[PDB]
Design a protein around this ligand. Structure first.
Ligand code: F43
Ligand code: F43
Ligand SMILES: C[C@@H](OP(=O)(O)O)[C@H](NC(=O)CCCCCCS)C(=O)O
Ligand SMILES: C[C@@H](OP(=O)(O)O)[C@H](NC(=O)CCCCCCS)C(=O)O
Ligand SMILES: O=S(=O)(O)CCS
Ligand SMILES: [Cl-]
Ligand SMILES: [Cl-]
Ligand SMILES: [Cl-]
Ligand SMILES: [Cl-]
Ligand SMILES: [Cl-]
Ligand SMILES: [K+]
Ligand code: NA
Lengths: 433, 560, 264, 433, 153
């Protein structure tokens, strides 16, 4: 069986000789808790509801319905409304429902009770029950009636149900609606990189962990971690996302002052050779050495760690997210040229990076790195070994992006800033072992 | 104020269809002439003979009608476009045969509104470029060359034939009068000139603010080859090419992707969003069109706001055709389809008579436009009176009942008159919606019939869902549309809902219902279809006098 | 047991509506079994009933408590096809109106699938059950054979001017007058039949107005039937109120306003 | 608080004076188990996989890929394959994974471990892990290689991922894919009436229960059972689906020999009056009595029970499903005419029935009753008070339908006929209190 | 453009299940004669013309001249009984290397309609219109050709 040493975000050892199965999405209680948290937690924009009602801007995108303003001030009654929402959504007193006023009354964080998720088939009960509880709380507090309550309902729910989503509404999840899934098992893959950067509070080590965990939870739900593929995926999670054996942190540190994508390639090959993961296979007439992988899944995991460290070194030097697309491409292209072994995810990180480079530097779609996610058509193709690097690059950016975490995901930061699994994911994963 | 006259508005059309007829007669002589009575059916039969001979396979033949009878065992009667002198054969109002109706939908489908502020901020932040009236002017020239499908950066590009894409263009609009005045007027939608009544221009500029937008209209031929999902993508590609050239950017650098995301998503205002799997459709298709946006596309409100009924009934004409004839009758079904389900709402001045009667009743009982109480009691009074009067008209004029021969037509027209009266009177779309459902309930009990087998699914769900606030039930009427669950299937409702959504804002003397960007965009006279007078356009199409875009005569043979 | 009241209103039209609902409709004519079968067009007069599945007794049934306490109709027990009768009724004071044909079926007959439309009203049932239901309707005061008729297709006519002889327009002319009587010589889908089904004399215009369930200006004016209007209003109001909130307090929620009724 | 007496499918009392909350989807362990079972259980058509491979008919719909037949016989090796599937999907020995060979080898029932659902966001992990485990089991058993395994993979997964679903595949759930949801919270609403009839083994009382439970679970997930609406929904579930106070059973028994839709209307009004749910409000000049509801949610529940009993009496007499559409319409239209009170779901059962009648008797769409479900555009509009009647009508049909339970849902019968929650739902719900 | 429009406007629809429905539910006999009547009906109605109701308006036949329906079958005896104008002749078209026999063996003795709705319709609308348009006029044609109620279960 495989064991790993767990190290934290500062390069400090947490636990030695941990069974690889102990960090599995199917077994580690901290990971299971992370998934439950992202499913059941929603953010409420009370300030947005108040503006929509006062300005009759229901649905957003410059909509204005003249004469249909509703003059209510929920930000000034945030504590009363929060208490009513909690009473309406809680299943039993003392259950895990939480409703907290943030931003001096501008927002609520609503952790809907787990039981409402359990009683359903998907994850949407948090969104639906919060929107319903808010609508009722506003109707009661402001004595709304037959013909104005519908407008307030649209301030909360947006254009639902004319649209499948609460478009222009004021209830937010880090997940999207199920109908946006590209395929089977994609809901946990559909987390905007800008959101991931805010969950991590721009700590790039914690970013790698949060993003890698959720990506691999998705891969497991897709049915793509069965049999031999379970070890393949778990080693990638551990070495790329969980700083196993301190490889990501130490390779970044070693290359952080003068290193480049290429020096990280070199250190990764040297480590694989020194650790027995690869060996010289044959030598060509020129002297070029063809390598062989003695442990195929472990060679991939080393490439995954190298891809992450290269992102941290290159995007960290740029203090800019955009270089992540070329870093994933050239780390893997060049490590193949250096060894004659296939790179991370057997070309699928490189391929993802090719299209991601194109779609972050062209007219045709995409955007900056913060708009991508594991469900995006451009960036879905690797089983979890590309997006964590994207999220890390978004976190390292010092201000070069137009669609930035602060401009698209501000409420996510406030909602998860004091949530322990997001504040210290590596410590919580290790403590759950 | 308006005064309802002593002669019903529908009498002229009856007399023009039936010269010399005693309009009180409940009986008629049937001659059973069949199709030969009718010039259009005879023309169709001859066309079917040519089709069959040319392709070696039977097609249209009136004698294939079942029972050994051809169409026209009764008299086949033509249709007067309401408020127009034009009387046309019924087939001339089938969407397939009517290019005005086709082009109205193509003009909506090929339109996207795209903000410019985010793109300009991107150029400033990432490249340090200064955006000026001069740089914007260069961009507007670039985008009007590239948008129809022509090249600006690469060498050895092939291009669209400019004559095939002559309807494609881009204009900008803004609430900032200073910017609007600096750009060549050929590139600008002039809000002040178009919205010169009742201070509508100031209402629109206040709502839009000092923000800048592009109204993009991609080529008709493209949406005809493809779908409405092409529109925002096509727009974004050529916006991006134009920014590259006009700001000397690298032709493909990271900042270009921010422009792409802005133009495709963040600053893009679709006409309609996507639909769920059972009726899967791309964006910019009719099922995603909200009633507020439909009402805002129609422009009679900027021409004559002092007559709220006229604009209201032009919205009905716009919506009933699109939603019943093209959307429900084609996209969601097909065949012969649903022409007369919709013509009932825009021909023979019938809905006009019933609605002006109600307007007069409400003016006298409740007072000026938009001042009536916004409550269920008022909806009840107006709907009942308007519906009873209309039913009495159908009972007293046999050829009126024979025109709206299907109960579904009668139900939609009586309920539209009820709800439009309530909208104008109260200024409230949601109260008007209660009046709509009340009309149906009143109608059903009077005659012991309503519409077709499945007409009142939304009807019977209707009253209780007006004032629901539950997730998939509650919704203000302006934001409902053809995907509101109860509304997702049936003829005789969707275009009428758009009509009384317009009626409520006309009664309130607003400049728009739901989105001022939509309102300005569709006011532009450079569109092919004249959104300011819907029924006049339909008459041109029915008379073969409407020239649509998108034809391929430039690139096809002819010959004997 | 509970005594039904069926429907409000005090005019003779409301009385007629309660007759149709309660099934207390007078028999006015006789139609032979063979004539009716020929008109319906599903099998030759005298022929065995075709089957869509075996008789229940022969094939057995699942162990269902509902099947075991609900008696099948004769046609269901036999496995008959589900077939239909369909009628069109003139808005010029025909005795019947579509919804009230459907209520007559739903209240007074077992195992029936009625459907209401503006220009047609259908009853689907196991063939032999459908025949019995159609016989009851066609022999009764619910039918004038000039103002109503069997039309399984091509139904146009309910809303049209009557012909000069008082017959409702039928594009297929399945019926006509001979010697004062209405004769049907095609089946309900327009196929000629080898007999003349004599449906007897049309009702006089006066008799039709005495027997009709429709409100219109030349009979009982709908505007004057304030009890029916009150009923419609009460149902709409309470539906609106309870969709907002299903409780008595909703009946005076803001937005209701000064609702008022004529007779209550 | 409200209490109910619970009765079984044969009209016998199970438990008295049960708190209405104890039958809630959020609280009753049997309901929660039913939801878990439908989420995580899949049927495998091994005979279908074998036929697709031997006939190169991958993807169905008359497809044939000449030359690409793969000659494998999984029905003959079903026990070995089942054991391998179990080993590949089970998370821990002794967990709730089950794999059972059915039909002599033609089919498997696979109950994927609940932990795989818990670790994901939706319910699809059962379908995906089963499909993956099967593909691997076949590859191993039959020594498949690089270029033929892809074809066998399509025998299992259908045309996925060219399509979003496993179209033409051989892994079946009673649920559909999430992207087919019409809106938020609809996954448990998307259960075909033919499937529900097979879950119940054509026991119409048990069909009412299974369908009503799942419909209301969906309504709860939609956020439409919050506050006062929780009592509204729970009373409808109890009285229409759980035979509360034996009302559905007794009304059906009382009207089963000679009754009609109309006599059931009459008994429902009489019961509401005798039980104090409604009272005479005012009397019109003609003597017509306007009634008032003294308990609005209870009056709805009585109308829901009556709608169900009317379906049992009318479709039971016809022994035919099609009359359910007119039964739901005319029961509710006539009870309003009889009382001047609004009918079931305040018109939404009637309205659903209007469109359902149309779309089960016209050219335009729909079909026979068996093709409808709570997610169908035609039949979605009532919050759970229409579809259970549809499923009951489908169960009562003696052979009039072309698209029947036996022709569309045969494998569902075999998969669930030994599953206790589906064999005796009313007894299991009562025992869980 | 026309290549794509020819693909988008095409749907293939089996006839066996429809024929089984008529047999089971109505007790109708399906014969080469009833199929021939159906093929005439569907080629009148498919382009957008009326067969049941009175006072219907219709598409201009010249605007929909590309719309038609043919049947095809691996049953050579049925194919030979239907007027050739309505039938795709597999044996004439697939005369090389025994391709006709391979196609007929794969299709078997099943019957299919190749429906091609009007180009002008998919140009005004989208490819989603195709299977729906096809089904509406197939339905109207079965109603007429088999003397059904025009709207029964
Ligand atoms: C602006 C981009 C970035 C982007 O997102 N798309 C562009 C431009 C876009 C535009 C150019 C239209 C115009 O000239 O105004 C269009 C036609 C798409 C559109 N918007 O309609 C296009 N490219 Ni490009 N584009 C092409 C190509 C190419 C080749 C051209 C290389 C050369 O040596 O000429 C290179 C990529 C590469 O190096 O591999 C290329 C780049 C680029 N392509 C660079 C601009 C290059 C430049 O500055 O000259 N295209 C091709 O390689 C062939 C097909 C050709 C496409 C037109 C057609 O198929 O007819 C066109 C496809
Ligand atoms: C076969 C159906 C069942 C169904 O699913 N659709 C039908 C037929 C369908 C066909 C008829 C075309 C043809 O004649 O070949 C089309 C045009 C749809 C299509 N496939 O293109 C249609 N109905 Ni219909 N259908 C209509 C209507 C109606 C009215 C007609 C009643 C009368 O008194 O004439 C009744 C419903 C009712 O009673 O309320 C009706 C029924 C029916 N409708 C009955 C046939 C009735 C008959 O046997 O005559 N339609 C209308 O009420 C007006 C609009 C009219 C539609 C065409 C148009 O909008 O121009 C047409 C809409
Ligand atoms: C990526 C995605 O765009 P978004 O990132 O969603 O804007 C997608 N475009 C494309 O895939 C464009 C493909 C055609 C142009 C590039 C050809 S190489 C689309 O519009 O749905
Ligand atoms: C119900 C549904 O059909 P299906 O049951 O999915 O076949 C749907 N049709 C419709 O809603 C037809 C609407 C237009 C024809 C009837 C107008 S009253 C559709 O095709 O997606
Ligand atoms: O007769 S039906 O109401 O089903 C269809 C009318 S077009
Ligand atoms: Cl394996
Ligand atoms: Cl290995
Ligand atoms: Cl005559
Ligand atoms: Cl109450
Ligand atoms: Cl509440
Ligand atoms: K198109
Ligand atoms: Na030319």
């Amino acid at each position: 069986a495989d064991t790993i040493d767990l190290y934290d975000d500062r390069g400090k050892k947490l636990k030695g000789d941990v069974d690889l199965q102990a960090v599995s999405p199917l077994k580690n209680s901290a990971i299971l808790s992370m998934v439950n948290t992202v499913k059941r937690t929603v953010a409420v924009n009370l300030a947005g509801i108040e503006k929509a009602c006062k300005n009759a801007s229901y649905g957003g995108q410059s909509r204005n319905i003249p004469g249909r303003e509703v003059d209510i001030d929920p930000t000034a009654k945030a504590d009363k409304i929060a208490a009513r929402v909690k009473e309406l959504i809680q299943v039993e007193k003392g259950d895990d429902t939480e409703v907290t006023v943030l931003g001096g009354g501008k927002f609520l964080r609503v952790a809907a009770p787990t039981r409402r998720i359990e009683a359903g088939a998907e994850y949407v009960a948090g969104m639906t029950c919060t929107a319903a509880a808010l609508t009722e709380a506003l109707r009661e507090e402001y004595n709304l009636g037959l013909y104005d309550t519908p407008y307030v309902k649209n301030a909360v729910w947006g254009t639902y149900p004319q649209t499948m989503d609460m478009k222009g509404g004021n209830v937010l999840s880090v997940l999207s609606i199920p109908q946006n899934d590209e395929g089977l098992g994609f809901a946990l893959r559909n987390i905007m990189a800008n959101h991931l950067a805010m969950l991590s509070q721009r700590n790039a080590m914690n970013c790698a962990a949060i993003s890698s965990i959720l990506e691999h939870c998705g891969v497991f739900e897709m049915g793509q971690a069965i049999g031999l593929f379970e070890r393949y995926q778990l080693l990638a999670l551990a070495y790329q996302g969980l700083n196993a054996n301190n490889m990501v942190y130490e390779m970044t540190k070693n290359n952080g002052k003068t290193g480049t994508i290429g020096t990280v390639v070199q250190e990764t090959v040297g480590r694989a050779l020194d650790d027995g993961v690869i060996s010289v296979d044959k030598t060509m007439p020129s002297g070029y050495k063809v390598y062989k992988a003695n442990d195929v899944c472990m060679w991939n995991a080393y490439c995954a760690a190298g891809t992450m460290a290269a992102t941290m070194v290159n995007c960290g030097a740029l203090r800019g997210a955009q270089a992540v697309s070329s870093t994933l491409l050239y780390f893997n292209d060049m490590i193949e040229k250096e060894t004659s072994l296939p790179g991370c995810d057997w070309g699928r990180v490189e391929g993802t990076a090719v299209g991601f480079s194109f779609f972050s530097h062209s007219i045709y779609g995409g955007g900056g790195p913060g708009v991508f996610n594991g469900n995006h058509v451009v960036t879905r193709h690797s089983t979890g070994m590309a997006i964590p690097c994207v999220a890390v690059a978004v976190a390292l950016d010092a201000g070069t992006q137009m669609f930035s975490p602060e401009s698209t995901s501000a409420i996510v930061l406030d909602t998860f800033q004091d949530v322990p699994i997001m504040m210290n994911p590596l410590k919580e994963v290790a403590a759950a072992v | 104020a308006y005064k309802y006259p002593s002669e019903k508005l529908f009498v002229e059309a009856l007399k023009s269809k039936f010269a010399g007829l005693d309009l009180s007669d409940q009986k008629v002589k049937y001659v059973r002439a069949g199709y030969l009575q009718n010039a259009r059916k005879r023309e169709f039969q001859a066309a079917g003979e040519r089709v069959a001979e040319q392709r070696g396979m039977q097609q249209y033949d009136v004698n294939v009608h079942l029972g050994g009878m051809t169409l026209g065992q009764r008299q086949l009667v033509p249709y007067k476009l309401s408020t127009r002198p034009d009387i046309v054969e019924g087939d001339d109002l089938h969407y397939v045969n009517n290019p005005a109706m086709q082009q109205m939908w193509d003009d909506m489908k090929r339109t996207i509104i795209v903000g410019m502020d985010l793109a300009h901020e991107t150029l400033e932040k990432r490249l340090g470029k200064e955006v000026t009236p001069e740089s914007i002017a260069g961009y507007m020239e670039a985008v009007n060359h590239t948008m129809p499908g022509a090249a600006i950066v690469q060498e050895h590009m092939v291009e669209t034939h400019p004559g095939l894409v002559d309807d494609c263009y881009v204009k900008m609009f803004t609430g900032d009068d200073e910017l609007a005045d600096e750009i060549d007027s050929q590139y600008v939608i002039n809000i002040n000139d178009l919205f010169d009544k009742e201070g509508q221009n100031e209402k629109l500029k206040a709502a839009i603010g000092k923000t800048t937008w592009q109204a993009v209209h991609i080529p008709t031929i493209v949406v005809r080859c493809c779908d409405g999902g092409n529109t925002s993508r096509w727009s974004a590609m050529q916006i991006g090419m134009s920014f590259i050239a006009a700001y000397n950017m690298c032709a493909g650098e990271a900042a270009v992707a921010d422009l792409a995301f802005a133009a495709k998503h963040a600053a893009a205002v679709q006409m309609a969003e996507m639909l769920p799997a059972r009726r899967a459709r791309s964006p910019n298709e009719p099922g995603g069109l909200s009633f507020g946006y439909c009402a805002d596309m129609v422009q009679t409100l900027r021409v004559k706001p002092e007559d709220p009924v006229w604009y209201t009934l032009e919205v009905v004409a716009c919506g009933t055709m699109l939603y019943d004839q093209i959307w429900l009758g084609s996209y969601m079904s097909g065949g012969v389809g649903f022409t007369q389900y919709a013509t009932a709402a825009y021909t023979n001045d019938v809905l006009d008579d019933f609605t002006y009667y109600g307007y007069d009743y409400a003016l006298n009982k409740y007072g000026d436009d938009g001042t009536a109480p916004n409550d269920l009691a008022t909806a009840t009074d107006l709907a009942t009176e308007v519906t009873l009067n209309g039913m009495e008209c159908y009972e007293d004029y046999p050829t009126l009942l024979e025109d709206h021969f299907g109960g579904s037509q009668r139900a939609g027209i009586l309920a539209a008159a009820s709800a439009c009266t309530t909208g104008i009177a109260t200024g409230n779309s949601q109260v008007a919606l209660s009046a709509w459902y009340m009309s149906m309930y009143v109608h059903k009990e009077g005659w012991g019939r309503l519409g077709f087998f499945g007409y009142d699914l939304q009807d019977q769900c209707g009253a209780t869902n007006v004032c629901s606030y539950q997730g998939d039930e509650g919704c203000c009427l302006e934001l409902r549309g053809a995907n509101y669950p109860n509304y997702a299937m049936n003829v005789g409702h969707q275009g009428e809902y758009a009509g009384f959504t317009g009626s409520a804002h006309a009664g309130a003397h607003d400049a728009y219902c739901c989105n001022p960007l939509i309102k300005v965009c569709f006011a532009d006279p450079s569109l092919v279809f004249d959104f300011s007078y819907i029924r006049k356009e339909y008459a041109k199409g029915a008379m073969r006098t409407f020239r649509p875009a998108g034809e391929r005569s430039l690139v096809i043979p002819a010959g004997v | 047991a509970y005594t039904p009241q069926y429907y409000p209103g005090s005019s003779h039209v409301a009385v007629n509506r309660r007759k149709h609902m309660s099934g207390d409709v007078e028999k006015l004519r006789t139609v032979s079994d063979d004539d009716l079968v020929a008109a319906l067009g599903h099998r030759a007069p005298g022929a065995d009933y075709p089957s869509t599945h075996p008789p229940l007794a022969e094939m057995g049934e699942p162990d269902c408590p509902v099947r075991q306490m609900v008696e099948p109709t004769p046609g269901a027990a036999a496995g008959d096809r589900v077939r239909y009768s369909q009628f069109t009724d003139s808005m010029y004071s025909a005795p019947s109106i579509p919804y009230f044909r459907s209520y007559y079926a739903a209240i007074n007959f077992r195992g029936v699938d009625p459907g209401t439309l503006s220009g047609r009203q259908i009853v689907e049932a196991r063939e032999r059950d459908m025949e019995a239901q159609c016989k009851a309707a066609i022999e009764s005061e619910m039918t004038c054979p000039a103002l109503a008729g069997l039309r399984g297709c091509t139904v146009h006519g309910h809303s049209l001017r009557l012909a000069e002889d008082g017959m409702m327009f039928d594009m297929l002319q399945r019926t006509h007058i001979e010697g004062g009587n209405v004769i049907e010589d095609k089946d309900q889908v327009g196929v000629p039949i080898d007999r003349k089904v004599n449906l007897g004399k049309p009702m006089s215009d006066a008799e039709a107005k005495k027997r009709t369930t429709i409100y219109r200006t030349d009979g009982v004016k709908y505007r004057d039937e304030e009890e029916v209007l009150d009923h419609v209003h009460l149902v709409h109001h309470r539906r609106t109120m309870y969709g907002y909130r299903p409780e008595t307090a909703a009946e005076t929620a803001p937005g209701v306003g000064p609702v008022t009724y004529h007779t209550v």
